[PDB]
């Protein structure tokens, strides 16, 4: 399936690397919408996580490290998977990559949140949305 990954390697390549948070907007209110309490969202909002995006064949891994978590997800694009989030939600996740945007949808208890990533001027721009609450986080590598 080497030959089967020609277009795959092209679309995933811009996302690969060890990204570090440089700026954040409205992340506390986004976390509030997820159901995280004030201490957790206030303290987590102050740190700068490292997000490592890698691939092994067709399997993508995204690792998130901070003072408060060390979590990772491994998945194939477009294939739903079970995920236990850092804030202890048990969700159904599907991650796709179209038009240069990696879109991660999490579904649980009839609720939904979307995490969209794109590369703009070599930076990774991450948009987190839940019920019309939007947070934007920018990372550099």
- Residues from 9 through 68 that contact Na ion (CB under 5 A): 44, 66, 68
Distance separating alpha carbons of residues 89 and 6, to the nearest angstrom: 35
Using CB under 5 A, which of the segments 16-24, 53-61, 69-77, 113-121 binds Na ion? Answer: 69-77
Task: Tell me the closest approach of the beta carbon of residue 105 to Na ion, in angstroms.
Answer: 21
- Which lies closer to Na ion via its Cβ, residue 51 or residue 102? 51
User: Residues, the chain, total?
Assistant: 141
| DSSP letter, residue 133 | E
- Which lies closer to Na ion via its Cβ, residue 44 or residue 126? 44
Task: Tell me the closest approach of the beta carbon of residue 69 to Na ion, in angstroms.
Answer: 5
Task: Tell me the closest approach of the beta carbon of residue 116 to Na ion, in angstroms.
Answer: 19
Task: Tell me the closest approach of the beta carbon of residue 62 to Na ion, in angstroms.
Answer: 14
Q: What are the Cα distances from residue 58, in Å, to 69, 79, 95?
A: 26, 11, 13
- Using the CB atoms, write b or e for 88-110: b if 16+ within 10 Å: ebebebebebeeeebbbbbeeee
- Which lies closer to Na ion via its Cβ, residue 38 or residue 68? 68
- Which lies closer to Na ion via its Cβ, residue 97 or residue 137? 137
- 3-state helix vs strand vs coil in the chain, percent to 5: 20, 55, 25
Mapping DSSP to helix (H, G, I), strand (E, B) and coil, where does residue 65 land?
strand
Query: How many residues lie near Na ion (CB under 5 A)?
Result: 4
Q: Which residues here bind Na ion, judged by CB under 5 A?
A: 44, 66, 68-69
């Amino acid at each position: 399936l080497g030959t089967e990954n020609l277009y795959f390697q092209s679309m995933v390549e811009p996302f690969l690397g060890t990204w570090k948070l440089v700026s954040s907007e409205n992340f506390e209110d986004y976390m509030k919408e997820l159901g995280v309490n004030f201490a957790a969202r206030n303290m987590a909002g102050l740190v700068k996580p490292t997000v490592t995006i890698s691939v092994d064949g067709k399997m993508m891994t995204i690792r998130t490290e901070s003072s408060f978590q060390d979590t990772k997800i491994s998945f194939k694009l477009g294939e739903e998977f079970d995920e236990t989030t850092a804030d202890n939600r048990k969700v159904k996740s599907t991650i796709t990559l179209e038009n240069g945007s990696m879109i991660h949808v999490q579904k649980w208890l009839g609720k939904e949140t979307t995490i969209k990533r794109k590369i703009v001027d070599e930076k990774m721009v991450v948009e987190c949305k839940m019920n019309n609450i939007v947070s934007t986080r920018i990372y550099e590598k």
